[PDB]
Design a protein around this ligand. Structure first.
Ligand code: TTP
Ligand code: TTP
Lengths: 198, 197
């Protein structure tokens, strides 16, 4: 019996590249706040952990900070996935799945995570599968081109994200495609693909 | 309802400094293998994670490797704390508690863990308290002097541990004392103190 088993309503995950518009999309559900559990914009936690900007440290020094940063991302997603609610619908920006299948995998490929750091994260993910219930009924994939994602990141202008290259976004895009369209990863709930290029 | 709740027998944790003799002590229960769940020498996992020696990397480059290493320690302890068994007694070398109250705290104090790494580990520990059941009925504290612990480490001669100073062992000793004798940490099951000198 997994933690949070049987405590969760129908759950929708909003996924897509950085700057694909997940938060914007989720904001359209604001008026229904009282009948839907809405968990949006988790990046605000990652930018301020008792005053420490983990997001910033990760971009400035990935070889030292990518592992604790992804570890913290995993934790916050788990807290969101398992948060109690009386509401009959839950919608979340991101999930433990994109952290694992897109970001951790890309950080392994680009050398930010050494093999031993990657293995530690993967062993944690395997333990989480066995011990924590993660309700996932539908994924909405906000599909964009990396060039469009790049412009949205620029417009928003998070200081932490000011050095993020288009190449990084191309890499992440292919990983989201692998996972959400080509089903290359053992994640099999339903996926609705939306054209988020507008 | 926490994961592993109601699946665990009476559980004993063996604690003490590096080289205090926890494994040696636990080895005396070998003949009762069939009536006791014995989980010993977890360091063997930390020295070989699909071929990677995390213990070694941590000692050689703590500022980069202390966080993933402590994260992996936490995970292996959790897997041991929650492992299923039909046996009526479980005895474990170490626990998630010593990882947290002695090693992580000492790594914070000596600068191996930056504040943000320490905060990440602590936030994980707080989530684990809320979500995972950790059976702990008795702790046996193998109390030693740091000089005696130092001798045993040198005798065993793990290559990873060849640069470990006596000062480090003095620091860890005080943390084990704080936790297991002076009750400075919010951990309150029963403690039996043994003279392991
Ligand atoms: C999920 C995740 C995000 N990040 C980073 C990428 C981003 O810089 C930041 C947040 O990314 P996103 O999770 O993509 O959030 P966002 O609000 O930027 O998305 P949108 O514009 O579509 O609303 O966190 C990681 O480094 N690792 C991860 O595991
Ligand atoms: C538990 C723990 C150990 N370590 C290190 C310390 C040691 O080098 C190594 C193992 O130490 P111990 O966990 O004390 O195991 P041991 O086998 O050395 O103990 P004994 O001789 O009493 O049987 O791992 C950490 O760095 N962090 C931790 O959280």
């Amino acid at each position: 019996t997994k933690y949070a088993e049987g405590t969760q309503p129908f759950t929708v995950l909003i996924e897509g590249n950085i700057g694909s518009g997940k938060t914007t999309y989720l904001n359209h559900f604001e008026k229904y706040k009282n009948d839907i559990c809405l968990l949006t914009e988790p990046v605000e936690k990652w930018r301020n952990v008792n005053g420490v900007d983990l997001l910033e440290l990760m971009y400035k020094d990935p070889k030292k900070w990518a592992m604790p940063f992804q570890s913290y991302v995993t934790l916050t997603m788990l807290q969101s996935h398992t948060a109690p609610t009386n509401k009959k619908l839950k919608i979340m920006e991101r999930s433990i799945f994109s952290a694992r299948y897109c970001f951790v995998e890309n950080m392994r490929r680009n050398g930010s995570l050494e093999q031993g750091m990657y293995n530690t994260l993967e062993e944690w993910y395997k333990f989480i599968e066995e011990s924590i219930h993660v309700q996932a009924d539908l994924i909405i994939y906000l599909r964009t081109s990396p060039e469009v994602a790049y412009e949205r990141i620029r417009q928003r202008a998070r200081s932490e994200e000011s050095c993020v290259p288009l190449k990084y976004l191309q890499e992440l895009h292919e990983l989201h495609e692998d996972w959400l369209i080509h089903q290359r990863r053992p994640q099999s709930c339903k996926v609705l693909v939306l054209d988020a290029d507008l």
